[PDB]
Amino acid sequence: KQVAGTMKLELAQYREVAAFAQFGSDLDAATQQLLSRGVRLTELLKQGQYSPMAIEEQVAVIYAGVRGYLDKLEPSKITKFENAFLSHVISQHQALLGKIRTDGKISEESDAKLKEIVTNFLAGFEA
Amino acid sequence: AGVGKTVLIMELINNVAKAHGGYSVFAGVGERTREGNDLYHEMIESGVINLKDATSKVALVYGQMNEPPGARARVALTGLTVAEYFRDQEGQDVLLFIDNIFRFTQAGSEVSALLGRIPSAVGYQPTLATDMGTMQERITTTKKGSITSVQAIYVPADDLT
């Protein structure tokens, strides 16, 4: 709920305006941004077939974008991230992932740990 | 769907049932049974359905999808008949919540066809208008009350003519 509600919502907003993604390539920034964010969110919607998932991953990855961190990284490279980052957190912050999974929500901490994680990891991924 | 819709309805039920001394008939017409269970729960929840009085604001008739077409079709008159009781007889200001009359329409419609009877064009009941009529004319302010119908209407095919 904490990431997704907003995301849906964000996608709506993106989407009317995804209409004029094409042209409406020339407007105000907010909206240009919305497209950018949107696009970012889109990458997430590109997802594998041959591909199941845990919630924590799902939110993880969403978290990144919805926390706008993807809005730094470029759309194709989101994808690169997505695997990589995911596998990364999977490796390292497996600790954390256990926790998020467990906690079923996102804890503030988890969030914080995430926040930082993503950002660094991201910093590394987008490094 | 439940834009506080459901709620709104409940509120209406609330206002009227009170305000005119009214009472209501709810026909969960083709109710999606689970959703009617759910529905229950809101009402209960809301207390508008009082378990503390089966003299809640609303009489519930639920006529779910799993019932025959006929059954789904007919629950509407059943309810309708009730509202005439409450109207005239209880003197009350009945609300007839028809939910959805469209789901009725469908329920009837299936019947007309299925009777092999030609229903009007596109399957529309032959008698679609009289079906409606026969039902509809049983709604009014008589003198001993009024049954004001609150008709949930799903605009079939978003098509109106």
Partner: protein, 264 residues
């Protein structure tokens, strides 16, 4: 006929509607800018004429048109087109100049090497003074200069409207020569002449911009029109649609039933 065909229409017509509207705000932005930015210019270009209607011009003999650069330009381009092929011969010689590549896109279509060069980027990002100076410069070396011109642009009035305006050239130093013009002077026809220069840019800029101002708002206008128009049209189809749509069903049920009114 078939709901399909109808969709070929509809589909795209919706698309258009949106798009047309897309073009609209865009145009509006362009426009928005176009007013605002018009201000110093306003003064400035108005400035150019200052002594050019107080300085009175025996035009001694660079006809140029200013319009859009784009499809969806309304009659921005057409107006000047009209009014500039009508001209071209007198000021002597058929030489025409298009600033605005929609100028010469209608008067491209009726002259071409009577132009010397023609300019774009007028639209598709909006003009600047520099540019006006650049063209101002080129105008000179082209000896059409000294055969006089008129400078025709879309003088904005309001978003919807401009009045294609025209002036006659004053970048000739043979206007800077003599005439009663001289008697308004206490300065030689050099630094005057080097104003004929300087002013060519000023005005050219101005006009250039005026045109584009006219244009951009008209470009919205075009975009209004269309997207409404599109809407109406959609509406109509939408009836016809359902009708046939339903019709089918009826007919179909018919065909079945009447097929059930036939042997099997």
């Amino acid at each position: 006929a078939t709901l399909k065909d109808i969709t070929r229409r509809l589909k795209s017509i919706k698309n258009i509607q949106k798009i047309t509207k897309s073009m609209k705000m865009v145009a509006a932005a362009k426009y928005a800018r176009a007013e605002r930015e018009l201000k110093p210019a306003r003064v400035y270009g108005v400035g150019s004429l200052a002594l050019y209607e107080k300085a009175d011009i025996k035009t001694p003999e660079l006809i140029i048109g200013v319009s859009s650069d784009r499809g969806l330009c309304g009659a921005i381009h057409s107006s000047v087109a009209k009014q500039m092929k009508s001209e071209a011969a007198n000021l002597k010689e058929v030489k025409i100049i298009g600033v605005g590549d929609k100028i010469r896109s209608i008067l491209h279509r009726t002259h071409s090497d009577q132009f010397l060069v023609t300019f774009k980027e007028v639209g598709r990002r909006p003009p600047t003074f520099g540019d006006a100076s650049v063209i101002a410069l080129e105008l000179l070396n082209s000896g059409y200069e000294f055969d006089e011109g008129s400078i025709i642009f879309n003088r904005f009035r309001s978003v919807i409207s401009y009045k294609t305006e025209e002036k006659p050239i004053f970048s000739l130093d043979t206007i800077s020569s003599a005439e009663s013009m001289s008697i308004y002077d206490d300065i030689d026809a050099d630094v005057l002449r080097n104003y004929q220069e300087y002013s060519l840019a000023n005005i050219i800029y101005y006009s250039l911009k005026e045109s584009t101002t006219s244009e951009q708002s008209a470009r919205m206008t075009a975009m209004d029109n269309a997207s409404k128009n599109a809407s109406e049209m959609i509406d109509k189809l939408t009836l016809t649609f359902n009708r046939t749509r339903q019709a089918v069903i009826t007919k179909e049920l018919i065909e079945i039933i009447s097929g059930a009114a036939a042997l099997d």
